[PDB]
Structure formats: C-alpha cells, structure tokens
Design a protein around this ligand. Structure first.
Ligand SMILES: Nc1ncnc2c1ncn2[C@@H]1O[C@H](COP(=O)(O)OP(=O)(O)NP(=O)(O)O)[C@@H](O)[C@H]1O
Ligand SMILES: Nc1ncnc2c1ncn2[C@@H]1O[C@H](COP(=O)(O)OP(=O)(O)NP(=O)(O)O)[C@@H](O)[C@H]1O
Lengths: 515, 515
C-alpha cells in the first residue's frame, strides 16, 4: 500500500481546507497588503530593546515553518520571507477578534502562507517579533514539507523539486542571486562602453560547421528542417559588417550531447564583438570586468575558496603564458620548426612517453600536443591566467599571429584548471575564411554562404570574446556541480521504479514520526 | 550568362587585393588604433571655423561610402562610422609618405574599411573634415555595395541580407537601438523593485497544455522527445512557491505556426510574477513603466505617430473599461445572467446580427462574445486602455473576481487596436487548478504534475504580468511589420528561381551603369 500515509494526509488536508471554507473563511484571499518585508522589518525595528513594544502598525506575510505554543492563549510562529525569519507572537489578549483567534490558531498548518498585522516588539527572551491584532491564511499547504534541512546531497530529489529545495535549503538561493549579479556586471560593463545588446536567431536552416551535435526540429508551414544554435558568432559578426561596431549577446545555446556535472543540454554564454580591437585589448577588458565582479562580492580583488581554505587572486594583471613556450619551458628545450611537420611529431612523441605516460590515437600532432599540454601544464593553472598564441595546428578558424610564425592571435583564460573565457583577433580575410569553411565541411563529412557574402563585403578588424556564464557562476559560488547554478537543470524522467521507491521512503519518514 | 558582371567584378577585385599585397601592403592589418569615434569627433571639433585647422592629431576609422577627387593631389572621402559621416580630405602635400599616398588613393574602393590619422579641420566650404598624415586599408570590399538608399520597400532583399540593409539604410539602426532601450527600461524598472532576473528551461519533456503548436526536437542520450517552450509561466510560479517573491524573465518563446507581419516563429516576451500583489497593482506598474519609456523617447509622456501625424497619450492614468459593461454600453442594455446560459446566447446572437453583420461557427457563447467584442469595441481602442474583468467564459485559467460574479481578475492592455500586455491576479487554488488542467488536457485531445505538486505545497497570492517585446518595439518605432524590429527574421529559403532572378537584376543594375 505504497505511499498510503501521504495520500491520507493530502486527503484530510483538503478536508480541513473545505471545512475551513464552509465555516466562512476564504483559504485563498485575493489581496493582502504587505506594508513591510521582514528584512526591512529587521532593519527598521532591530533597535528595539527587550519587552519594548512599538506603537507602529505594520503588516507582514510569509511561510510558516514553525508553529509551537506554550499555551492556548500564546502561540509562536516562525514566519519566513526572503530567506529571513520573523517570529509571530500570537497573544490572545492582544488579538482584536477573539473568535477568529481560536479558529485561525487551530487551522494554521506548517507550510501555510500567512499574513499578520500588528506591533513590532522584542520579547524578554530577545527575539524580535510581531504581535498581531489580526491575521489570516493566505494560502494553505496541502502536503508535509520536509524537515530543515533535507536532501544533502541526494542531488536527485533536490533538482527534481527545485521549489522544495529552495524552501528547505534557503542557502541555495544565495547562488542564484550571485548568478544574476554576474550577468548585470557584464551587461553594465559592456553597455557603458557603447555595446548594443542584441538578439539573434536560435533557430537556423543551416546546421553549422562545428562538429558539435545539434538539436533538430521542424517548421511546419515552411516544411523545412531547422537547427538550434551552437553559437551566435556569425550573426553578430554580420552585425559588425553592417555598421554596428560593438555588439553583444547573452544567450542560450544548445548541445545535443551528454549530461554531466559540467554539462547541461542548454547553457548560457556571453559573446561580444568589438571593431578595431585586438585580443590584448580584450585581455585587459577581461581583467577589468572579472575584477569588478570579485570586488563586488568581497570589497577586495582576492577571493577565498575551498581547498578548508585557499585564495584566488583576481588582482590585475593576470599572469599570461605562451602555449608552445610553456610546453618548451617544461620539456627542456624547443620543438622542431614546422610544428605540423614529421620531425616535430616524432619529437613530441618522445616527450609523450618521457613525461605524460599517457596519450591517445589517432596520433595527429594536434592531439598529442593537446594531451601533452593537457596533463603537463593545463593541470595545474589554478590562479587566473591567460594562455596565448596557440598554434595554427590547434586553431583552424583563427587569424595568424602578426610577428611570430605558426602561431595565432587568441587566448584562453584558465582558472582552477578550467577554461572560463576566450578571445580572438578575429579572422577577417574572406578568401581564407571561405577555404576554412569548405575544409571544415569536408572534414565533417551545406556551408553558410550568407555569412561568407557578408564578410566578402569587408569585415572590419574586430576583437571577439566569449564567456561561460554557468561555469563562471560555478566558480564564484564555489560549487563543483553545474546544476547548483541552474534553476531547473535537465532531468532524466524518473520511471516507476525510483518513483515508487521515492514515495515509499517519503512515507517511511512519516512512519518514523508516528511510531 | 546570368550574373556575369558581378562574378567579373568579384574576380578582378580579388586580383586587385592580391596585387596590392604583392606590392608589400597588408589588406588586413591586425590592429589600427582609433583614438576617436566620428560622433565624438563631431562633438569635439564642430566649433572649428572655416579653413581653420586644429593642432591635434587624431585617428578615425570607418567605411568609405564616397570617393571622388577634383585632382590627383586632392581626394575627398565620405567615411562612415556609427551611422555618422566624416569627410577625409586627402591632400598630397599634407600626407607624409608621398609614395604610399599614390598607391593608397588609387587602391581605395567604395565599401572599403579604412583608417586615417591627421588633423581635424573645417574646409572653406563648411565641411568638417580630417586631413590625413597617414592612412591605410583596414579591410577591402570585394563586391559592389548597392546605392544609397536601396530596397524600399522590397522587404525580401532587405531582410535576407540584413548586413547590407544596415549599411544602405542606416536609419534602420534607429529601430534596434530603440528596442534595446526598451528591455533595459523594463529590467531597470523591475530590478529596482527587488525582482530577481532568472533563466528557466527552453526545452521541456512535457508539451504544455496550451493549444499552440510547439517545435519538437529530440535528446539523444536520454532518448526522449522534447518541446520548445510556449511560456516560462510554470517555472517562474514554481520559483514563487519556492520562496523567491519577485521574479522575471525576458525570454525567447517558440510557436510552430504561420509567418505574417505580426508573427515570427521565435519571439521575445517579458513575464514577471510578484507575490502579494494583484492586477490593480500591476496596472499602476504598467502605467509607470510605459510612461518612463515614452518620456525617455521624448521628454514628455505624449508620443507622436503616423495617421501624417497623430498622438498616443501615455499619460497616467490610462483609461480602463469593464468587458461586459462596455459590451452592454454599446448594445443598449444588459446581457442576461448566467452569461454561459442559453438565454444569454440567444440574446447575444440578436446583437450579432443587429450590429456586427459578422460572426462564425461553432457558435459558442465565448466565440460570439469574442467576435462581438472583436469588431464592435476592440476596434477601435487607439489610446492606451485597460480592458478588465473578462468573464469566466473567456478566462479558463484565471481567478474569480472578488466582488462581482461571473467575472475574473485580469486585464489586457490595448494600444492602437492591438494587445500589448496583460496581467492577472493569479489562480492559486491547487484543486481548481488541477481540475482546469485535466479539463484542458481533455479539450486538447500528459499533464504537468510537477507544477501541480508545487502549488499544492501552497502558492502565495501573486500578480502575473506579460509583455510582448517585439510588438512594443513595433509600436514605439512606428512600424507595421515585426521584421522591422527583429534583426534576422525567419526567411523561407529562396530556391533557384528567385535566386537567379535576383542576381540577374543585380547585374542588370551594373549594365544600367556601364552603358
Ligand atoms: N553543455 C554545456 N554546459 C555548460 N557549458 C557548456 C556546455 N558546452 C559548452 N559549454 C561552455 O561553452 C564553451 C565550450 O567550449 P568547448 O571547446 O566546446 O568545450 P568542450 O569541447 O565541450 N569540452 P569541456 O571543456 O569539457 O566543456 C566553454 O566556455 C563552456 O563553459
Ligand atoms: N509569433 C509571434 N510573434 C510575435 N509575438 C507573438 C507571437 N505569438 C505570440 N506573440 C505575443 O505573445 C502574445 C500572444 O498571445 P495570443 O493570445 O496567443 O495571441 P494570438 O493567439 O497568437 N493572436 P494575435 O493577437 O494575432 O498574436 C501577445 O502578447 C503577442 O504579442
């Protein structure tokens, strides 16, 4: 008889509410006027001393998380609003309608949304409270709210029912408040520099040259197959061709791939493009922006993190290293020239066995170089640091470096062994761009001719920048799971087995109480 | 020999660029330092008198739209930056490298992105200009830019190649700058009131109870079918259940339906939910917000529009009318009670023939009432005005009015005979909500049990609000087509017929020149 006690509680709770309404009480009043929020309440009335009572009449509202009474004429309620608590001392003598007092104080169930109107006070016990002249049920709770706290970790139950989690684990709200703080920070930073915030299509008739697997859908009237975007890059660049010199979008991208702690099916990034700027400029901008964020969080530009503690030093400037130069620094000496040549490869392999003791197949120069960099220096790069001037071997769609050969003009910002952002001195040569697109298409086995036309019409020298929003929030909230900063992460639909098991344990809880 | 002259121009233009590079000139320099934008230039150096020359040395960059010379030693260029123009007086005697002067002034093609460094001046003709000490090609244009202006209307060619449109019709940029101004206005308005800006899923495993046809896609690893969102409502409401009292999202919604001047496949709306507020509150908020926007646009809260002119009066308060009361005002007398009853219907039909001379089948009370309101009073409602208290007949998922029967607590804001926004005193009764969802499911022939659970856990009295961003921008830019405020609207892929025809006419243009 799976989940019997919870169905019983639900049924009886519905009965309670209907009887409450039959007695002439509306369980769902249309409007209650809240004059003050409990954080505001606390801010204003904290100066009250013990047993002192204000003359003011205020009204507050929130969720009842605690209901306990030392008397039938004296009840104490923990009312929760904006993740903050205020006690409600329901004292009968101070309650105007002495008839409503009984029915109300009897009806109130833990989890109910209630309003109260009365006098601020600080009790003799020191507890800041409100003494109600009147009060009412604003919305009844028809289930048993889990204890506080509940589900730690047990990410499943948490992220299934985010609405319960936010209630029993209110600390979690701190994360999401941080995340919005982040996007505002970037918006401001860019807006104040003349950037136009735009919106580009999420649906495209062209799949995109990137190897990433896309979500595929269908438009009925046009009878055509369409694809969800992997990045806004092309459209934004078209905007820079069109005369809008500085654009950015903070948008939702979609990858039809796996789900792990650093990957959600749909995620959020910021891209911007800025005419007449290069990756150096973007480097200083990145320093500036991230610095501002961290100082907003703390006051200083040094943040504290776990592993107990440690400090990430966001102080400008960030350290910066050259790719192949760091590889050669730790190797012992240089890599043979033509890096994409055979001698360079046979060289690299010798270090692949000497050092890494790890590598993979196919053994292209790019991939051995990538694994080499991957566990030789990429781990670890804990402090914020720019890795710059990647080879053409690694960078197919980038612009060649202006001084030293076989390198390109990019960087990837590493923090805590992870990539957070990246930038480019964008390739604006339309002939080379065409070659690269046709080559890309060939390796993947239609190409974006609209975009090619656009930059054939002259694309200004431009700086490009991309930031992972979810991952930056992850890094700044000090969490190791991306679902911790996404409100409703994508969940594998729970079938009957774990559904039954879950509801079963939920009832096993109630049994753990009643016996 | 379709499009021969344009292929010829492209080919020869590529030749030109390669020869330019063979002579030791880089057509795509990596970095040019712009010290000043031409709007800034104009702002700073406009006080210059005729034939007066500044001592300053500044550098500017933009797109050449005009190149004409009265001499081989004196050339005049219109350089365009941020939809603003600055003349470049290339005077040989003032140019340092007298060898680069010849090759440069010969190489420059209309459409090229160029940089210049030199002295601000105002010529004897009154034209504010810059006299270059040096200059260079920053990016060569490999096609013939259309004349200015071009494609008016001919929306097809315009919206296909938005990057050309923005160039030859720079006025159009004014629209998009307005649109962003709009979203900032709402964000600010809400942010300053404690709203948390959030992001909710675009992909759902549940289709949604609304009759609107959704885009359908597939997640591979989970092997499940997913649906693009019709609205964020449910998730946001779950957030209000979870203790976050004021939330909003400005997001991309998707409807797999037709494409016309007021409908794009993907569009943008703003939704917010606000605990302990009702639709009256939301009405005043709407007045406030829209007022602020219009005053940002003008200075006063009265805006001027076409049909030549007319004024929309956004001055607070907006007029407000009751639905059935306006219907009865224009009818002559009241509608029989039980509005969803037979007598009321047989009544309504008599006015449907008396007045409208138009109606449709099936003839439900809701639909005859809807057409009646539709051409009897809905047209016209030109000044901003709230139509309130719709019947339950019209409002399935709303909360009942608190005083007068058979009405609900909503409004729809009408401006220029159109619906711009809407709000509700949200239904928070979980039992009724369940009934309505099951009924909805039945009419449509799975239901969102997660959401039902959420509000069964007690949903506070809440105000709900929705605004159409694209349509509000439409209304404020004074445009009758939604593509005028969407950067890359969805286009039916042009097959070979109109492609050939287009390219053909494009060459017919060049022929119109050379002969
Ligand atoms: N599924 C996802 N969830 C969250 N962020 C993502 C996701 N996919 C990509 N990103 C972000 O977008 C960028 C992806 O770059 P990319 O080179 O494609 O990484 P990757 O190949 O998926 N390997 P990884 O570093 O593990 O993400 C990074 O800045 C990530 O922060
Ligand atoms: N395809 C679309 N393009 C732009 N805005 C849209 C689109 N579909 C809906 N909207 C907006 O979202 C809301 C849609 O409400 P709805 O009752 O569904 O209108 P509708 O049934 O599509 N008939 P209509 O008034 O012509 O849009 C309005 O505020 C519109 O501004």
């Amino acid at each position: 008889h799976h989940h019997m006690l919870s169905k019983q509680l639900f049924l009886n709770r519905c009965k309670d509410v209907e009887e409450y309404q039959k007695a002439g009480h509306n369980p769902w009043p249309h409007k209650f006027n809240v004059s003050i929020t409990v954080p505001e309440f606390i801010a204003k009335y904290s100066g009250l001393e013990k047993s002192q009572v204000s003359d003011d009449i205020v009204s507050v509202a929130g969720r009842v998380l605690s209901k306990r009474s030392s008397s039938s004429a004296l009840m104490f309620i923990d009312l929760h609003d904006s993740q903050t608590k205020l006690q409600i001392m329901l004292n009968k003598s101070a309650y105007e309608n002495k008839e409503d007092f009984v029915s109300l104080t009897k009806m109130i169930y833990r989890g109910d949304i209630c309003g109260f109107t009365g006098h601020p006070t600080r009790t003799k016990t020191g507890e800041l409270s409100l003494i109600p002249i009147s009060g009412m049920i604003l919305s009844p709770c028809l289930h048993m709210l889990p204890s506080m706290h509940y589900g730690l970790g047990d990410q499943e139950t948490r992220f299934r029912k985010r609405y319960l989690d936010l209630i029993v684990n209110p600390e979690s709200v701190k994360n999401f408040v941080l995340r919005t703080k982040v996007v505002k920070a970037v918006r401001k930073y860019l807006d104040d520099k003349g950037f136009l915030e735009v919106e580009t299509p999420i649906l495209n008739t062209i799949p995109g040259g990137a190897t990433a697997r896309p979500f595929i859908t269908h438009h009925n009237q046009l009878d055509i197959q369409m694809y969800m975007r992997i990045a806004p890059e092309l459209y934004l660049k078209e905007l820079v061709v069109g005369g809008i010199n500085r654009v950015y979008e903070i948008g939702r991208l979609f990858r039809n791939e796996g789900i792990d702690q650093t990957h959600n099916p749909e995620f959020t990034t910021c891209e911007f493009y800025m005419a007449y700027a290069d990756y150096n400029d973007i480097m200083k901008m990145t320093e500036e922006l991230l610095g501002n964020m961290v100082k907003d969080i703390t006051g200083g530009s040094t943040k504290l993190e776990i592993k107990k503690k440690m400090v990430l030093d966001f102080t400008a400037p960030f350290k910066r290293i050259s790719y192949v130069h760091a590889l050669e620094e730790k190797f012992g000496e240089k890599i043979p020239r033509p890096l994409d040549g055979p001698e360079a490869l046979t060289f690299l392999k010798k270090q692949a066995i000497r050092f890494n003791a790890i590598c993979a197949e196919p053994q292209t120069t790019a991939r051995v170089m990538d694994k080499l960099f991957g566990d030789l220096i990429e781990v670890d790069l804990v402090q914020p640091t720019f890795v710059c001037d990647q080879p053409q071997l690694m960078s197919p769609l980038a612009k060649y470096h202006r001084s030293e050969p076989e390198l390109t003009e990019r960087f990837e910002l590493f923090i805590l062994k992870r990539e957070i952002a990246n930038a480019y001195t964008e390739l604006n040569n339309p002939i080379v761009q065409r070659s690269n697109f046709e080559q890309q298409a060939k390796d993947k086995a239609l190409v974006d001719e609209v975009f090619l036309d656009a930059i054939e019409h002259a694309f200004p020298p431009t700086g490009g920048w991309g930031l992972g929003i979810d991952r930056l929030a992850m890094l700044l909230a000090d969490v190791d799971n991306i679902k911790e900063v996404i409100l409703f992460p994508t969940m594998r639909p729970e079938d009957e087995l774990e559904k039954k098991a879950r509801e079963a344990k939920e009832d096993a809880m109630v049994a753990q109480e009643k016996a």
